[model samples]
Target chain A: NITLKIIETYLGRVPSVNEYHMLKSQARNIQKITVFNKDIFVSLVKKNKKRFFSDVNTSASEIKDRILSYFSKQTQTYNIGKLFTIIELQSVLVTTYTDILGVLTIKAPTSMEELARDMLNSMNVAVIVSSLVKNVNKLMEEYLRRHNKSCICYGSYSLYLINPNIRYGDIDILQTNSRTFLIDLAFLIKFITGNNIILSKIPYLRNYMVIKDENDNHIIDSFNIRQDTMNVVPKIFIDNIYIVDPTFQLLNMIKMFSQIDRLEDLSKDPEKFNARMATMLEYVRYTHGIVFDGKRNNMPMKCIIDENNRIVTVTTKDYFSFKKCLVYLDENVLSSDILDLNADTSCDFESVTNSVYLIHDNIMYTYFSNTILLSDKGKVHEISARGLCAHILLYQMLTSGEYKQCLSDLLNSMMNRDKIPIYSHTERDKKPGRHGFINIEKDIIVF
Target chain B: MDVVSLDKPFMYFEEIDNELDYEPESKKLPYQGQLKLLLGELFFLSKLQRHGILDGATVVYIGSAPGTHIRYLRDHFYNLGVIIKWMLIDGRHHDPILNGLRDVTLVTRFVDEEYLRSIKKQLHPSKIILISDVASPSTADLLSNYALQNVMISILNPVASSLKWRCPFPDQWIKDFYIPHGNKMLQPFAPSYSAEMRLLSIYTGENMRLTRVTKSDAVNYEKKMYYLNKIVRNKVVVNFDYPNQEYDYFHMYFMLRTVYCNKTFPTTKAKVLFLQQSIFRFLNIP
Candidate 1:
């Protein structure tokens, strides 16, 4: 009589209370999944399922019951810290060999900025990025001291690092052989964070941390491409924690933006991607001159993504355009064209006519001009030198402790301050001479 | 990677540094090649002096090859009577070109963070010049990693792409504004030399803004070489002037013109083209 009522409540209800109890007791024997292990339980069930289910014959509903029970156990015991601390950060050197070339203003958000969001609001992106830099430098320095290590970091905190939501935050080490540092590092970090019930994946090439977003969904924590710490290592004020060179950053940035899977995964928020890509151009332009080179070849590239990913979606556009790669700051960006064509620099007409020109049409937009900027998402483009210089000078002024300590009525006078045109001629084909008359008492040379 | 060893990079610039006034290698390079190196150094120094960045400043050079551009700076500024301190770090051996200087703090066997942090504290110099030819990201990190505040960030591997000169005409004063009053004193080759000098004046002296100008991008480099060859016969020799009758205006013209048209270029690709003009300069092929 009770069995009849149970079948009405659910289609797959067992025939009776005794039968339900029998199925429940059998599913329980599928081997309880444990802390710090998955393979043991999975194989245990795979081997003995034949003996246990020889009677039920392993139908689809039988398998569903088994999976549901297993996952349910994992869901109950899941801890958020596991996701945040497993990812590592491999930072590059300070100036590395530090015969630094020159100074530059970083244009876009670093790939590392993504990790900061979990620990901070978007407002704290800049400050947190700076702080993480110091931490990675400290940690990497510590690890390198004990052993004859080339580049290695204990990626114990790699999980907590991921839940932080930044992408390029981990310190990558080329020597996969050094696994001891991770255990030691995890030991200290877990002690410091004071959390327990952590699991370590043994002999893992990279830490695969899982984080549930605002909702309950599992997501992996890293995007991996093995290389040295170059500029994007601190790519743009960026910093010295990681020195992912500009070319590597450029290629990686573009490749990530273009991946179809990456686009759909970020389907809800493609704007963040659009922003990173747009600013990447400016960063590459000022830093790497819009081209990443390796060996002896200029890595000229072309793509078609979104200006901000707002104009179109994966549904609308198939690819992300690295539009700025095609741009060249020739006389093209200048206001009136030269009257005489024959006297022009040895530039061929092919480059002249077919190039993306950064002109001063009263308003400046990003030079991603193969397509119109579909929305207000992108506002920064090419600023002529005067305004560019003005911005830097203002940054210098607000940052300067020098003039404020020295009394000047100009303290109140926006007009009293003079403009210092400190220009970096970034275009590889162009060389501008000593930009101004400011007295430089001594030559400052960076390797 | 930390450089395992750097014995000392004094092999290239040492002998020259010791001699206060030694002439060129006893033989080998012609006056044209020498003139090119000299002019390049001369123009670069004048640019530096005017900028004042070269005055009494200690240089902290970061990127270093087995050779040092700092050496070029040292060679140029040694005669300028300025006091500049030196600090060199190239991951491997501390530096070349700057090896023999007593002041250089060498970080030859240094590549670890522990090693770097120990030295990084003492690195705050008065001014810094950052120079590099690598990709921009590392260059950017190298220069901006520290708060050098007002340090001079000079990039190495500079290219030529200035808007001021592309397709623009020369200033009108130098644009065919040739005056003719001085020509009456000569009859034989005066007219030829005068016209030649007028044309040549646009390339050098005060009018020399076009520092690394190129001839036609035309690839018929050999064809141009064939013509540059027909200019002089076997009679050309240096310092044969005055009563010795060496450098008539024509011979001087020939030497100067060869340099301006063929020898002065920036990249190896351009120099290869320039080499065609000199490939047979010393040969008696005819």
Candidate 2:
């Protein structure tokens, strides 16, 4: 269960509350980097802090330039009317996903028998990922060439800058769901998101045929089919639906609240103001346990009260003072119930988004409806350790921009600090542990 | 072309060598006779025994005429299941010429040529006993007069099938000539009448050889008497008219003369006339 105390303790170290909020918000957008050698990157980030930061920023800018140059060259070569067509955007998305994420690391069996079985499985994964990425890239390049346009941005999160020319319907939501919901969301938000919408579309994703007779008369059985799609909602949507849907007006409200000095001007636009209020109301209804009644006599507020009789309120608005209540009531109530499931999860008006958060103890605990809902004790410990390592590597990539170099440095530091066992005497002998060394060696040989 | 030794009456034995002679010494005559008898017994038994001495011996006739006695030899030997290796070498004689020989036509030519060119070449030639005609008079004299010297010579005479011109003597001379010249006659013991026409077991010093010959007088005499009497009676006269009668009469006269010279005279001239009539009838000479 997440307590305010925990949040407070973590944030209190910041000199300013604004800085604290900035860090918290930025941390969510910042993806964990899966460096090939995390120990090296960590060491580099620690030992050469100044150089690391400068290098990362420069390298990132250079990468951005290089990507832009590549797209421009492609447009010129193909004579694509637009330099940044929707197709090119998809191409960039697919290539980055495949080259960086899909091909980054692979899972391998530790033993010979397991390795044999995994050989085919691993090859299948590689073929699937490679073909998908290639096809998507080809389509995107063609689309861009045909339409004379370039992409809006050239960064890791460039998908946010899709061209408006291509209609939403033209984009394959299924592929998009697979990319952002299944894979990217897991990496960026530290958790897989959304129901397996594409998987469900597959003929036998959840079913298998069992032969009962020689004539093949058999039975069809289903497994792993989500009984409730709402529960399997992707964490990406749970984290970013607010940006995707402006109708929710959550972003606007956040903006308005951030600049409360001009709140009077914002309130002058009653329609816009009422939409924001309505969006908040919808957000609360979908995410919170609170109930509201319009009747003046029935001002029943369901609140969790401790022995002291102090009401625990979870609302987007501040403490319920006499003036604040009047203002809140006057504002158009955007009932949270009106928000769709995807929108409700994304628009975290009160930060009640269901999420599996990594704690300092190298453990992962899920919070839903402002409560810790599930705890996978073993998985939490494993994921938390990985998350910490990932966080350190990410810091290096962000600081050095040279992903490969930063990753090597981070891995070195991890090994030095943790005293991990390494088998090789090479300069880059920053293997995580003996086990890790075997795993990485096997993985390299496989892929 | 020239009669070099006409003074000797062209004695056939003059040109023959004395060494390797086939002379039977008087002192061993009884033993030789006993050997001959024993060999005859073995020959008769081998044929009746379902196995013979020449059971697998191959016989080759180098100058095989269509109606040579070798033909009879083949029949007798083959009937005994001896696997005779018969061959016919028509040296200096065109196959067409041989085919045109009197009594030799498509039937006899086909039999001889088929066996010689096709079958005989396929068998082992070394197992065969080669029989060739003596081309030179000298060779014939040597073979006839010097039995010991010409003992290796295996000659076959065409009797019934030879053209009248090809044979210098009548067929009766062949029967008389072979009586003493044949390997079977050289044996000390004579062949019995029962198996005279059958293969004879002859001893040639080294090995006893089996061979076939014409029927002896014991068998031929009866057959000859039957024909002679039928001819002499003139009961089968083919020519009733005077012109044809003259020709028939002349032919009968020549036949009777030869028969008389060969001591094969008919019992009566009427029988001779009857035989002449039968010949005339066959010629349709009326």
Candidate 3:
């Protein structure tokens, strides 16, 4: 009965108080079953077989199946497929039952009902299976989340669950406010351009609703919209936002808009605003392209454009025949090419020939040249610069007193021959030296 | 007159001198020296009478110092007509004497080398006589071999009036040598000598008597011999001036006679007699 209760508890249910009373009375019957003759008791139990199966089978089968399905679903979804298939689960069930029976067998049973109660008390198949199922499910879930795609959603509701301070419902508010602000800014820019454009021309105007501040004041500035509101959202909520194919320019713009508000609050200080604007523009140009060409032909643009746009760019009919070029860039440059490579060589091809001749040259010239020089001396310079920045870490071990003890656990994974070079001096061999220098390649050699 | 009496033992000359010189007037005096001399002569004469010429009869004398008292026997004993062989010995000698005695077969000085050599030559093939002097204690050692045999010994008295004689011959020689003083001289026995000279002479008939010499008589004779041979040394005799005393030196003449005659006389008795005779003549007393 304790096993039955423990199983029910594992399945998120509790046994009734009358069940507890019935179990205690059954324990007294089990005590009387021992001293009674075994032959007579078996005859007695056979004659009253209905009482033995009726009271026990229903609860035992129900709890056992619950535990079985719980573990079966956990294994199948995580690719484990089945529990203890390689080992027979029935043997495990029977052996567990025998061990519990050995403890019950020592008690005295004064009557046939007591003998039947003692045998029933030793049944622990439901409890043992439930514990096994619960522990296995926990391990499988952890493994699946770490190695495979997780069942956990990443944006909105999923993000709010990871950090409760972030609410999906608030994200909708934030998006709506951002859209309203963007539409307002578009109109305002048109107005500044000396056009009689109507507010209806602004995108997303009908759905825009102005948010009010606690002072009941209207936020008319784009700076106010970003700084006083959007910037206040938690970073974790934004990290999970999944900004549809986000690009460096979009991120930089958000950052710049947020900063511009601060500068404006400082009373339109042109120097501060100009300074912040310069950085923002540089990051934007780096993510998109230089505005002089108006080309959005880079990785940040590729990342920001929707997938449909990506496919359209690959088609021959797209407007900017340049989108065909971008498709090439996407295939040979933006998608597979290292981003730093495109940054350093984005202008290497001629527009007329449409051929990129010196892609590797620009790589060598722009990135590698400085990298080689800096790699040789830059790390030492950095350490020295940091040395000027702070005092030494002064990592010193404490002196062990006479009786005080210190113990450290070590993980010594001896590198095998297959991981290290066979010889240290061959042309293919790389020597292992300090500071990432090696004569033998580590992958092909082992100790 | 019983000079031939064998029963009468002859006393020594020294014994007689001691007896007579101290005898009381009531004791009768015996002629002891005379008896000895007379018996010695008769003993020789009887040896001759028993064996004619005395051939092979040996005579030995002890203490025969230079033959002093036995010089008369050389002739008188030979007159009995017995052939005699004479042995003479003296125990002490200053120089050699008795150089020539015709019938003397052997002569020995008991201690002297020359005489012992002469006597040892004659002792072969015959019985021997040993002679010793009673006065010389060494005579007993010299003659100890013959102490029980025929031996004659002589001892002289210091007084010049005594003498002794012994014989190694049997008692018969003593008896034979005993003769009366009135007996006539017997015939002389001629004995052969190496030089063929007459060693003895004798008278055959007429009255013969044996005279005895005493101490006083020997003293008188020594004095006569002393003066007769004296050499005088005297200063010249003168009237009214101091007269020189006469000095007679008799030593040399007395010594000559003693050597020749083989005599021993006391010099002290000779000096006394010389002084007495000088005083008696000077006083003209007979």
Q: What are the per-residue Cα lDDT tens digits for candidate 1 across B27-131?
A: 122343323223322232322222223333334444333433345445444423223445554545523334433334444442334543444444442333332
DockQ top scorer: 1
Candidate 2 docking quality: incorrect, acceptable, medium or high? incorrect
Q: In model 3, which runs have C-alpha deviations exceeding 4 angstroms? A: A1-447, B1-35, B44-48, B51-53, B77-81, B93-99, B105-108, B111-121, B126-133, B137-286
lDDT of each: 0.25, 0.24, 0.24
Compute the lDDT of residue B25 as modeled in candidate 2. Answer: 31
Tens digits of per-residue lDDT, candidate 2, A79-110, equal 11121121222232333444333321232111
Q: How close is candidate 3 to the true structure, as a TM-score?
A: 0.16
lDDT of 2 by residue, B1-286 (tens): 2111111110111121222211123111223323332222223222211211122233433434432333333333333222233345543432332221111212233223334445334442323333333232332343353232123232221110110001111223343323222222111122221111112222222222222223353234333322222222223234332233322233234323221111123354554555445433432334
* lDDT of model 2 at position B187: 16
**Tens digits of per-residue lDDT for model 3 on A1-447?**
554544233223443453333233222222232222434322322222222122323333333333343322312321111211211122222223222212222232111223222212221101111112222222222322332111111223332333244323222222312222323222222212222222111111111233222232332211111121122222221332322111221222222221213223433332322332233333333443433221222211111112322211112112111222122212112212322232212221111111122224312111100000001311212211111111101000111111101000000010010111111100111111111100110111000
User: What would the C-alpha RMSD of candidate 3 be, to one decimal place?
Assistant: 90.9
- Candidate 2 - chain A - TM: 0.18
The residue-by-residue lDDT of candidate 3 on B1-286, one tens digit each, is 1111111111111211111121122111133222223333433333222211122334555455555334444444343222234566555541122322334522344544444444445443222223232343232332342232111211110000111222221211211221112111111111110000000111111221223423454343233322221211111112111121111112111211111111223563453345334323432334
Superposed on all Cα atoms, the candidates' RMSDs to the truth, in angstroms, are 29.6, 54.7, 90.9
lDDT, candidate 1, A277-372, per-residue tens: 333333444543332222111111112223322211111011111112212223222211211111111211110011112212221212211211
Q: By summed lDDT, which 10 consecutive residues of candidate 3 chain A come out lowest?
A: A406-415
